[PDB]
Design a protein around this ligand. Structure first.
Ligand SMILES: [Mg+2]
Ligand SMILES: [Mg+2]
Ligand SMILES: [Mg+2]
Ligand SMILES: [Mg+2]
Ligand SMILES: [Mg+2]
Ligand SMILES: [Mg+2]
Ligand SMILES: [Mg+2]
Ligand SMILES: [Mg+2]
Ligand SMILES: [Mg+2]
Ligand SMILES: [Mg+2]
Ligand SMILES: [Mg+2]
Ligand SMILES: [Mg+2]
Ligand SMILES: [Mg+2]
Ligand SMILES: [Mg+2]
Ligand SMILES: [Mg+2]
Ligand SMILES: [Mg+2]
Ligand SMILES: [Mg+2]
Ligand SMILES: [Mg+2]
Ligand SMILES: [Mg+2]
Ligand SMILES: [Mg+2]
Ligand SMILES: [Mg+2]
Ligand SMILES: [Mg+2]
Ligand SMILES: [Mg+2]
Ligand SMILES: [Mg+2]
Ligand SMILES: [Mg+2]
Ligand SMILES: [Mg+2]
Ligand SMILES: [Mg+2]
Ligand SMILES: [Mg+2]
Ligand SMILES: [Mg+2]
Ligand SMILES: [Mg+2]
Ligand SMILES: [Mg+2]
Ligand SMILES: [Mg+2]
Ligand SMILES: [Mg+2]
Ligand SMILES: [Mg+2]
Ligand SMILES: [Mg+2]
Ligand SMILES: [Mg+2]
Ligand SMILES: [Mg+2]
Ligand SMILES: [Mg+2]
Ligand SMILES: [Mg+2]
Ligand SMILES: [Zn+2]
Lengths: 110, 74
RNA sequence: UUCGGGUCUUGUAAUUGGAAUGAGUACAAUGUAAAUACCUUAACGAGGAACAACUGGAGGGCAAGUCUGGUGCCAGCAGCCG
RNA sequence: ACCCACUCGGCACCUUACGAGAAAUCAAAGUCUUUGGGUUCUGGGGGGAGUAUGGUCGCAAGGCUGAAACUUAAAGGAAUUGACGGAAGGGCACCACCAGGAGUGGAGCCUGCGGCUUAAUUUGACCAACACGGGGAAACUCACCAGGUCCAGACACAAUAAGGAUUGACAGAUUGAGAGCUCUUUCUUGAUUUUGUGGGUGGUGGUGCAUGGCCGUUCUUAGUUGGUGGAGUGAUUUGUCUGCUUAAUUGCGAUAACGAACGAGACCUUAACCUACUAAAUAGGGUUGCUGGCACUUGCCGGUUGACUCUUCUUAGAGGGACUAUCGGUUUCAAGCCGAUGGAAGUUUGAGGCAAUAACAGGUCUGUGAUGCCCUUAGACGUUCUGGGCCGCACGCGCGCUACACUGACGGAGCCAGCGAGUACAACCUUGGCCGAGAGGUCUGGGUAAUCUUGUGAAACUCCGUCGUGCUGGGGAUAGAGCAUUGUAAUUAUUGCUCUUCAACGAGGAAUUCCUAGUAAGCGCAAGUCAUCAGCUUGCGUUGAUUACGUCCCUGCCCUUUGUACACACC
RNA sequence: CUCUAACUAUAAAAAUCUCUCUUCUC
RNA sequence: AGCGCCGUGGCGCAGUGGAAGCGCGCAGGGCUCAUAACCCUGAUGUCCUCGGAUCGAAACCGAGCGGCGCUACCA
């Protein structure tokens, strides 16, 4: 809350958006720990722990916490680091859990 | 805001009813009696007047001009 | 008197003509110890004169676009502000 | 010991710029671009950093000396305008409080949001969203969903094409359909069309963070602005203020300020007062007729569209009236305040309507054939038809309505308003007479309106009785059955009426809302929604108070002073 | 053109805040 | 085995002779533009099980159940 809200874009996409899948390098991951400087640690669904930058259009536009499903784009020149591109608000995450693009051993439910 | 998706249809298609065109259609309606008198193969409709030909499909004759009000069993 | 001759000139047009010339080739001769090369010069050598000039920039500093398409704080640009 | 005058030396001080500074300011910080009296020490953007190292002093603490690598586009100084202060001064506001009143928050219900659910439960707002979009949607509305139609694709060109570009259809399958939507067959129709290109339209499709217009808010406070003139190098400032007064940047005034402009006020509507004017069968009154009754005295209460006359009330025009009028206090005795009297009226007489500069990324593309851009433009996000939804329900919140009863409920009887509105190319307001217990039905008659509904004979209220402190004759939610009305259509009860079950509810925590006189509160009526439907809103009137007539304590607002490392401004 | 008088006096607690800053010529 | 202690509503505690407790949790609401702080209201039992007295038992007591600590493994 606050007087900040009226300065915003007022982009009201409350209705159910169509979830975006993974495309040739964009992959799903889970936030493991929150770091500083606007950077996060994402355990990808491949047995690797990538370091994902909180990225443009996402920095102060959506607020993300520990244990959040996420979509992240890799970089072919440097595999260790990557960029968080989209965030799924815990509803379509269930849908992906049933469809199982990610290993179901990562069970994160409220 | 509005979040609309591409519409998906649970129906194959409905096709425009193309009119059945008939080449040399008019002559089939008549019959020349050897360079002179002529007759009409189809039947004339009384309500419209002379000339308009009744339609025969099965055990009845049907009109085109006052089509709705005339369909008389053969 | 609307004009308007353009009366007097200056540009713009894949229209159109006649000239001049090298950059190149090359008889020679000069040049040089001998040769190149230069100066001179026969004979050729310009029409899209294709014999075709690039290197940077067009927000400000700083001369020049708030034209068109593409990408959408990506890619990238930016000596600094951006 | 003082007093007067002078002088030397010292800590100092006031005024001023005619000098110096980026200014705050300095009589030195002057005699500095018109640059040189002598001389010592220190600094070369910020950070790293007065850190490490190496010396040196010290018992120790630590002192003196003292970088770089690297990083950074600024850090910093003075001042100007705002904003902010749990800083100060002076004033205000029941969207603040004190003294209170009525409440809400507890209950049931109606409605509006969120969430959940769903095919859809269409969406925009989150003091200044939430009975708001006039949003009381059964169809339409409509914007959502499952389906079904059509082009309402202008125009130009090409293309077919008059031995058919094409259109339409009885009956059947199909369909929810009596849809020639699609098929079976065939018949009808004539250059309007059909299929491709360009283009154009339509869109409650997106973007109010592209826009207009409008409205809301900052801000109901009194605040703004520029022209000459003064001070500043300048951003700016004075005019716009020390005081007192006012609701007011309202005035009295003092003054580097003088004259002005917008706002406030003035101004209009409305409410009062008009025995003064003009008048009135679409308003009333008197006298007298013609009658009814009771009294018997000539009088009372009535009826008549019979006559004459009048305008006090009812109307509406021109005007009058109040300007703090007179008087008494108090006021640099000026602006003005307080009181009494006369008044109708003495809070700006009450209530309003417009209502300044600057601004919000406040809302609205969903009001507009206002609209830029983007999207779509044929099985369409166009339009239309059928049905469903916008009303679901483990839950929370916001406007309200009915109540918890004795100052009451229920019976009778009394009988009192003011705003309205009302039918024509349609069917409105309904009197009256008959039916029905009621809703209602029917037959007639008025009214396109001071004429008729209508004196809207409204409720609260009043008088007499039943009830008797018992969740009871309170409360009427939730249901069962039936009778009617509007409607093409009422199930997911439209609404009204009749009989019954009668639930929670014992004056409601924290907290919080509105309001100082015909005010709050109670009570209803009319109008807007309207074919039918309000528990809503806009207005109107009835009965009608308690408690203030003050304050800056909470929440804020206005001006001034001060501080700021804030200016996307204390979120 | 003449003068030196009046006076007081309260301190409870109150932490934090995220986007995003956009040309001025006759 | 005996003796000392005890018997949550989720945890730590309290009165136990007059009938459901507090605090910390959890849910909802309130204040605030918003969060924490703060304020208000609940929804959770067999205060372990079987009996005695009693208007009353959970207490007071006893006819037991289970868990901790001292004696300490008590041929
Ligand atoms: Mg906005
Ligand atoms: Mg170039
Ligand atoms: Mg370039
Ligand atoms: Mg370019
Ligand atoms: Mg330039
Ligand atoms: Mg330095
Ligand atoms: Mg330093
Ligand atoms: Mg040392
Ligand atoms: Mg400073
Ligand atoms: Mg308040
Ligand atoms: Mg009070
Ligand atoms: Mg009430
Ligand atoms: Mg309530
Ligand atoms: Mg409630
Ligand atoms: Mg809904
Ligand atoms: Mg306000
Ligand atoms: Mg309705
Ligand atoms: Mg419909
Ligand atoms: Mg509808
Ligand atoms: Mg449909
Ligand atoms: Mg439209
Ligand atoms: Mg806006
Ligand atoms: Mg204003
Ligand atoms: Mg000036
Ligand atoms: Mg000023
Ligand atoms: Mg009169
Ligand atoms: Mg006087
Ligand atoms: Mg007024
Ligand atoms: Mg549109
Ligand atoms: Mg539509
Ligand atoms: Mg609704
Ligand atoms: Mg409201
Ligand atoms: Mg009753
Ligand atoms: Mg009346
Ligand atoms: Mg009862
Ligand atoms: Mg309404
Ligand atoms: Mg007052
Ligand atoms: Mg700053
Ligand atoms: Mg703070
Ligand atoms: Zn016929």
């Amino acid at each position: 809350g606050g007087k900040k809200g009226r300065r915003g874009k007022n982009d009201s996409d409350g209705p159910k958006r169509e979830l975006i899948y993974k495309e040739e390098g964009q992959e799903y991951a889970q936030i493991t720990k929150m770091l500083g400087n606007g950077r996060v640690e994402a355990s990808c669904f491949d047995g690797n722990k990538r370091m994902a930058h909180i990225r443009g259009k996402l920095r102060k536009k959506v607020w993300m916490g520990q244990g959040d499903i996420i979509l992240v784009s890799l970089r072919d020149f440097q595999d260790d680091q990557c960029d968080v591109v989209h965030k799924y608000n815990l509803d379509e995450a269930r849908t992906l859990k049933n469809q199982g693009e990610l290993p179901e051993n990562a069970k994160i439910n409220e | 805001g509005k979040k609309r998706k591409k519409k998906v249809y649970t129906t194959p298609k409905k096709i425009r009813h193309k009119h059945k065109k008939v080449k040399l259609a008019v002559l089939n309606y008549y019959k020349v009696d050897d360079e002179g008198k002529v007759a009409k193969l189809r039947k004339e409709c009384p309500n419209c007047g002379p000339g308009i030909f009744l339609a025969n499909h099965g055990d009845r004759f049907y009109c085109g001009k006052c089509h709705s009000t005339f369909a008389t069993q053969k």
